C-alpha cells in the first residue's frame, strides 16, 4: 500500500513461495515416513510384532513421559540414552556376537580384523538391505535377528522395571523405579524401540540410504553421512556468507540513519490507563513468578543430573517428581511464562491503538483470559504429575496426562484449552485495533504489518492439534515443529519486531516511515529463512533427504539477519540517552538490548553450530543442542518477555521508579549466569560429546559408562554455580516487577 | 602514541602472538615432515630407491613444471589428475588385483563382497601400519607391493613420454609429448610419486592417521577425515559467525560515522608534478599491458583444457607453448602487473610524502626499477621456455628455468632479481618519507602505519629464497605460503588500506583521527586471521594436525571483516558525490568499491567454502579453489591495481578526462565476465568434481574419464563466453589508460 507496495508484495511472494515448499514438504513427510509394518516376521515365518503392538508401544513410550526420558530419533532428552541408537548398538552387537560364535566359535573381539570385517558385511547387509519392507508390508528379518533382539530385552526391562541389578543405572539416567511399571506395556514399548531402531538402520527402498538418512552414526552398519549431506552443508555455509555480506551492503547503502527529535514529554505517560490496563499487574506478576519457578525446576532437573533418584535427604522424590516430571515442568513453564510476556504486552498495547478506551468487557476478557492460563498450567501440570505416577488410566494418557512430545507434553485437553485461549487473546487485539484501521486519513501500514504479527502469534499455535496419539512419529514431528519453531521462532520474531517499531514511533524514537519500511523488510528476511528452515528439525526423523537439502539451505538464511543485530542493539541502547523521560526506559531498553546480543550469540552462532547436515548428523541430541536452546529460548525470548512486563509495570505505576542497584545486579547476573552456564558446563560437556559421536557412534556419547565419566559429572557440578548466579539474577528481576506492580 | 597508543600495543601484540604461533608451526613442519626414507627395499631385500633417488624425481618433476602439470599433495594444476591421488589409487588397485589372484584366483571385482571386505583390510594394514619408517630410516614394503609399483609404470612412463597408446590420454591432460623425455629422469620422477603416495597412505609414526593427515580421501585404505578435521571444522565456524557478530557490534557502538566538509579544490592536483611522478606513465601502462597479455593467456590455457594439444591450424603449438608453459605465464604474469600497480601507486605517493620534490636521481631510480622489471619478467619468461622444452640442461632448471611451484615458478636467480627490485623500490618509498617523519608539530601514526605497510610489501617476498632446489616438500610448502598467502593477501591487504586512509585523508574525505584508528584497528585485525591463517594451505602437505587446527581457526578470522566490507564500499562510492572535482575520481572509486564486493564474496565467501578442513580434505585440487583463485586474486587485488593506475593517470594528466561510456562499459564487462565464468563453467564444474570426490575419491574426481564427460567438456566450452566478455573489459580499461597516459 503506498510508498510501501513493493515491500508489502515481496513479503507475499516470500511466504507464499516459502509456504508452499513447506506444505509440499509436508505432503512428503506423509508419503514417505518409515512404514509402521504390518507384520515383523522371522525367516522362520513366526510372527515377531505387528503394526498394532508398535503402535501400542508409542502410546507406553507417552505413558512414560516419551522425549522427557532419553531421546527417540535424536529428540528428547539427554539424561538418559537415546533408546534409537542405544537400542540399535546394543542389537547389532548381539547380533555380531552370535554370528561369530556360529561361524567362528569365538566373541566378535576375540576374532581376527579380518573375520570382523566379513561379519560386518554380512551385518550390513542383513540390516540395511534384507530388512527393507516388502510388498505387502511385512519385514523379515533373520532367527539370528530374533535371538538378538530377545538377547536384550532384559536390559531394557530392568531399565524401564524394578530390577535391582539395574538401579544403579536408573539413577545413572535420573530415571525414577518402575518408570513403566506393567510388563506387558514394557513389551509394547520394546516393540517401538526396535522399530525406531529398524527404520534408523534398513535402506531406503528405492535408496542406499536409511529412512533417517543413515542416523544415528553407526560404525557398525555403516551409518555415515550420505553425499548429499556434505554438499549440502557446504552450501548452506555459501548462502549464510553470501547473505550476511549482500544484507550488510545493503545496509551500507540503503540506509541513512536519520536523526529524531524525542518529545519532550512522554507520550506513552499521557494517556490515562484503561481498567483492563491496570488488570495486567497480575499478569506481569504470573511472569516474573512463574520465571522464578521455572529456573528453580531447572535447578531440581539439574540436581537429578548428578544425583539420580535422590535429595540430600523424607520420602522418595523420584517416585513423585521424578526428572521427567521437573524437566517437563521446566520446558512447559519456560513456554508458559514468556508466552504471557508477550500477551501482556499485547494487551497492554490495544486500548493504546484504540485510542486510550476499552471496548465492552474488556476488563472481563482480560480477566477470563488470567483465569484460563491458571487453569491449563495447573491442570496439564497436573495431569503430567498423574500420568507419570501411572495413576491416570492409560486410555487417557494423550487427552490429559503426558503425551510425551518436547514442547508439547500437555495433556491434548489443555493444548485445546490454550488455543481457545489465545484466540481469546487475538480477539481482545484485533477489536481494539477494529476503530484505529477505520480511521480517515492515516497511514495503517504499520498497524497493519502489527496486526498480521498479532494474528500469527494467535493463530500457529493450532498445527499443534494436526497430529494425534497414534499418528506416525514423521508426521508429529512436522506438525510439532510447526508450532515450536514457526511459531515461537519466526512469528514470536516478528511480533517483537512489529512491537518494537510500534512502541518506538509511539514514542517518538523513529519516523512512521522507517519503522514501518524496517519491519516490512526484517519480516520477509525473517520469513523467508524460518519458514522452510523448520525442516532443520526433521533430518533424521524419517524425512526424505530433499527435506535435508531445503531445511539446511533455507535455515541458513535464518542467520543472516541474526549476525548483524548490532545495528538494532546500538539503536534501542541509544533510545534511553534521548531525553531525561526516555532514561526512565533504560532497562527495558537494557533487556531489549540483551535480546538482540543473545539473537546473535545464542540463536545465530549456536543455532548454526548445530545447524548444517554435517554438523547435525554427529551431535543432534547432544549438549550442544542445551547450550543452544538455553542461549535462544532465554537470552533472546526471555529476555524480551523481561522487557515487555518491565515496560508494563513502569507504565501501570508510573511513581514507581526502577531500582537501578537491584536491576543492574538482576541484569548482569542473568546474562553471566546464563553465559557462565554455557563456557564453563555445557559446552565443554557438548564438546567431549561431539568428539565421541564422531569417533565411535552416538550410542558411545550417549553411554551410561561416558556420561559418568569423572570430568563430565565434575562438569555438571560445575553448572551449580553458574545456575546460582542466574537464579539470583532471576529473583532479582522478579523482585523488581513485583515492588513496581504491587 | 598519542591517542592511538593503545592500538599500537593491540597490533604489536597481535603481531607477536600470530607470528609465534606461525613460527612455532614453522619449526613442526621442519621436525615433522614425512621423511624421505634412506632406502625403500622389498620385503626379500632388494633396494627399489633411495633417498637420492627421490630427491633425484623432484628436481626431475621440477624440470617438467610441476605444479602446473597437474597436482602433487594437491597443489598444482588442474587438467592433469593430482599424480599423488592417481598413483595411490592406481597402485592400490594393482595390489587389489594382484593378492585378489593370489588369494581367490580371480580379479578384485569379481570376488564375493565379504572377500572383498577381507582383501581391503589386508591393504588398509600393509599400506597404512606396515609401511611407516623404521628407525634406520629404512621403509620395507612387500613383493606384492613392489609388483603392484612395476605394474603401473607404464602408464605413467607413456604419459611423460612418447607413447602413442597415450597420446589421447596426453592430449586430455593438456600435456605435450614427451613432458619428460628422459627415461631414467621419468623413472626418478616416479620413484618421486611413489613417494608422495607413500607419506599420503603411511600413517605417523605415533598416530593412526597418515602423513597428509589422510589425504586424499581414498576409501580403499580408508583416507577419511580424523575427528579432530570435523572438530576443528565446526570450531572455525563458529569462531567465524562469533567474530563477525561482534565486529558488527563494535562497529555499531564505537563508530559514530562523522561528516566532513570536502576541500573546494583538489589538494592533489594543486601539487605540481615532479620528474619521477611523470615517469610512471610507463609504469601504467605496464600494468594494462600485462594485464591484457595476461588474459589472453588464460585464454590459450583455457583452449588447452578443452583441445589439449592442437590449435585450430602451422607448426605444433604444443611442443613450444604447451599448456605448462601458457599457465605459468599466465599466473606469474598476473603477479607481476598487480605488483606492478602496487609499485606505482607507491612510487607516485612517495614526491607528495616529500613535499611535492624528489630526492636526488629518483628519476633515475625510478627507471633503474622499470629496466629491471623487465628484465626480470623477460628473463623469468625465457627461462621458463627453455626450461619446457628441455634445452636448459637439468642442472640450471631451478635456478634459471622453471622452479615447478605455482606461483613462485620462475628461477631463483630471477626470483633474487626481483627481490632487489621490491628493495630498490622501498629504498626510494622510505627516502621520500623521512622528511616527513623529521617534520616537527604533526602527528605521524598515519605515515607511521603507511610505512611499515610499505616496508612488509617491499620485505616479505624474501622468504620465497628461503627453499632450495632439493628441500623438502613440506618446508617448501610453507615457505611458499609465506610469500603467497602473507605478502600478497596480508601485507597488499594492510597497504591497500594504508593507502586508502593516506590518499583519501590528504583529499580531505575523512579525518585523520578516523582515517588513524581505522588504519590500525583493520591492520590488527587483518593480521590476526591472516598471519596463523596461512596454514590453510598446509592441511594435507605433511604438516602435523595441531598444524590443522591453527590454520583453520585463524584463517576463519580472516573473513570475519571481510563479509562486513559494505560500510567501506559505501564510504569509497560516496566519496564520488562530495564535489564536482571528486566526480573526476568517479572510476577509481568504482574500482575499490569493486574491490570491497569481491573481497567479500570471492575472498570471503568463496574461501571459506574452501577453507574448514572437513570441505577442503575433499575439495583440495578441484575447480572450486580456481573460482576462489579468479574471485579473490583478480576482484580484490586486480581492481586494486587498476584502481591505483587509474588514479595515478587522472593525476599524471589531469587535462584528460575519463570517457565514461568506455569506462562504464570496460567495468561492467570485467565484472560480469567474472560473475559469469564463476556461475556458468567453473562453480558448476567444482561443484560436479566435489560430489565425485566425496562420493568415490579424489582420484576420481581428476581422472581422465571424469573430466572428458560431456557435461564438463561443455562446461568447460561455456566459459569461452564469459572469458570473451572478460577479456573485452579488460581490454576496454588498457585503452582508457593507455589514451589518458599517452
Ligand atoms: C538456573 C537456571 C536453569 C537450569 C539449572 C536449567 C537446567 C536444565 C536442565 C538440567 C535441563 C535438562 C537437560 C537434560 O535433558 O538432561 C534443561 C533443559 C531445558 N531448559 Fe533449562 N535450565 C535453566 C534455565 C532455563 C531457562 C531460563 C529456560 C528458558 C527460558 C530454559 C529452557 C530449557 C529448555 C528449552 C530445555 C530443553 C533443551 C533441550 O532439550 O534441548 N532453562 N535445563
Ligand atoms: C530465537 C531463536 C531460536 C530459538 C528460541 C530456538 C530454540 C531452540 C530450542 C529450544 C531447541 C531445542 C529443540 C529440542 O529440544 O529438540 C532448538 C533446536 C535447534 N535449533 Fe533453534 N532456536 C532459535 C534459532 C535457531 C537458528 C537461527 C538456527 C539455525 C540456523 C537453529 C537451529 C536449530 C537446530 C538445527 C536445532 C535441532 C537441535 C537438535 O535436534 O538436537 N535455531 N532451537
Ligand atoms: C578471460 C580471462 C581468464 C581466463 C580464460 C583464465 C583461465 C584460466 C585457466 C584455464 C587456468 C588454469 C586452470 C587449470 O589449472 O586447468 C587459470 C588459472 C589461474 N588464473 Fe586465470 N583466467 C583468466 C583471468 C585471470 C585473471 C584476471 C587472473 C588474476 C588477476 C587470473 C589468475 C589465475 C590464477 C591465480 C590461476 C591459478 C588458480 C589455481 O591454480 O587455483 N586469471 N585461469
Ligand atoms: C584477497 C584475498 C585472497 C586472495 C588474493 C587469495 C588467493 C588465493 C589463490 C590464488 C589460491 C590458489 C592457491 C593454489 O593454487 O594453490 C588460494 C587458495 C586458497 N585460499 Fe585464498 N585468497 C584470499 C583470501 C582467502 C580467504 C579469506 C580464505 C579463507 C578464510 C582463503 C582460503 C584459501 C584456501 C583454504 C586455499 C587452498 C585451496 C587449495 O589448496 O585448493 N583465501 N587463495
Ligand atoms: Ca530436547
Ligand atoms: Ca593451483
Ligand atoms: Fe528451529
Ligand atoms: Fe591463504
Redesign the interface.
Known sequence: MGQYKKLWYLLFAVLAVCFTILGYMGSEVYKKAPPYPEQVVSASGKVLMAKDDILAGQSAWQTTGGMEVGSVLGHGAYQAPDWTADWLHRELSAWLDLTAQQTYGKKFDEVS??EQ??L???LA?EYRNQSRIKEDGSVVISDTRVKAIESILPYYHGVYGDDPALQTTREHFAMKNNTLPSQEAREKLFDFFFWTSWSASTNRPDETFTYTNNWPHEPLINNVPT?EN??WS?TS??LL??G??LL??????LTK?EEVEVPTEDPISKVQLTPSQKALGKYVFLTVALFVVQVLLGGLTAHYTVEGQGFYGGFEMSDWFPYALTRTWHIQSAIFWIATGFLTAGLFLAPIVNGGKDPKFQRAGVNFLYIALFIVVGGSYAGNFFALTHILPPEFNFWFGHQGYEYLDLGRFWQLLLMVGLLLWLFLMLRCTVSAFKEKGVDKNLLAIFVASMVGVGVFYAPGLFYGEKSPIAVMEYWRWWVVHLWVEGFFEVFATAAFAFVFYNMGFVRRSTATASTLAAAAIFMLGGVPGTLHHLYFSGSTSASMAIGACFSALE?VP??????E??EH?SYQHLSEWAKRLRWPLMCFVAVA?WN??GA???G??IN?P??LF?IQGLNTSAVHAHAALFGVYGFLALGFVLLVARYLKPNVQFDDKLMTWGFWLLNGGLVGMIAISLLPVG?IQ??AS??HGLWYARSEEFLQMEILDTLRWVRTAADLIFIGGAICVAIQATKIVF
Open positions: 580384523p579380518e570385517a566379513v560386518k558385511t554380512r547387509d553425499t556434505y554438499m557446504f555455509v555459501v556468507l553470501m550476511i555480506g550488510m551492503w545493503g545496509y551500507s547503502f540513519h542467520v541474526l549476525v548483524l543485530l548490532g545495528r542493539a546500538y541502547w546480543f546473535m550469540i545465530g552462532v549456536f548454526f553450530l548444517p554435517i554438523s554427529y564438546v561431539a568428539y564422531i569417533t
